[PDB]
């Protein structure tokens, strides 16, 4: 029923605020300069990166840096998933599976919140790394971020806000089709309810946005391709770029993924 769906929506938004210190609302305030605090330092080149590195080749340092933020974000997304009603009651192996396949799809979703067509906010929004600088990195590191920018620009054109994203994220995590799930049904049941809540949310929050719900569901599938490309890039690096490892948590997520 409607009231329950709105209370679900609100519960998810509150959880999202409690789990993610840097929201899309805050990010956009920063990117548009409608905030009181200092403009972020721009990293647009090598020595610009040097000065910011305050506040081992360049491409590796960036890639190592990404990992620390990635594992921090994994921790945030896990804490959020544990606030989705029904989730902690699932068989624990299924929670692991849900998390393993879902986590980077969520990372890239939320990273779009910190992106515009010119670059990405880093270190809690205090830095801005241009898309051009990241594209400048040597093969194969310069190919990492570009598909995410391409997704983010189109994703951001939907103009979802944090309240929309909280449900969107929950729907993705509760995907009944992840490989190797033990008990698909109780996952689909929870997801069905979250989808109902999302449909109602988009209708009330964006009454005039044509086929928004259908557009959103499509993006969920587009995210898998983004993760696919990232993973194949990591496999290249594993095979051919050997002096620098992957954080143990990330190795665990990626091991036997698909």
């Amino acid at each position: 029923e409607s009231a329950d769906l709105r209370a679900l929506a609100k519960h998810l938004y509150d959880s999202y605020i409690k789990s993610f210190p840097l929201t899309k609302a805050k990010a956009r305030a920063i990117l548009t300069g409608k905030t009181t605090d200092k403009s972020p330092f721009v990293i647009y080149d090598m020595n610009s990166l040097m000065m910011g590195e305050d506040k081992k080749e360049v491409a590796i340092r960036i890639f190592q840096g990404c990992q620390f933020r990635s594992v921090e974000a994994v921790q945030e997304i896990t804490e959020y998933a544990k606030s989705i009603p029904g989730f902690v009651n699932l068989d624990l192996n299924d929670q692991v599976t849900l998390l393993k396949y879902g986590v980077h799809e969520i990372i890239y979703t939320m990273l779009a919140s910190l992106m515009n067509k010119d670059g990405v906010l880093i270190s809690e929004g205090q830095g801005f790394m241009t898309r051009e600088f990241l594209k400048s990195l040597r093969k194969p590191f310069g190919d990492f971020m570009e598909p995410k920018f391409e997704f983010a620009v189109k994703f951001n054109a939907l103009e979802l806000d944090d309240s929309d994203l909280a449900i969107f994220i929950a729907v993705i995590i509760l995907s009944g089709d992840r490989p190797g799930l033990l008990n698909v049904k109780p996952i689909e049941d929870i997801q069905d309810n979250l989808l109902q809540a999302l449909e109602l949310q988009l209708k009330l929050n964006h009454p005039e946005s044509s086929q928004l719900f259908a557009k959103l569901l499509q993006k969920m599938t587009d995210l898998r391709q983004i993760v696919t490309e990232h993973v194949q890039l990591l496999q290249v690096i594993k095979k051919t770029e050997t002096d620098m490892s992957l954080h143990p948590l990330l190795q665990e997520i990626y091991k036997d993924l698909y």
Binding site: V74, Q75, T78, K82, V88, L92, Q95, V96, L99, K100, P248, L249, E252, I253
Partner: peptide, 10 residues
Amino acid sequence: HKLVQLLTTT
């Protein structure tokens, strides 16, 4: 394993 720790933490 590390995922289990994160998941069951309170």
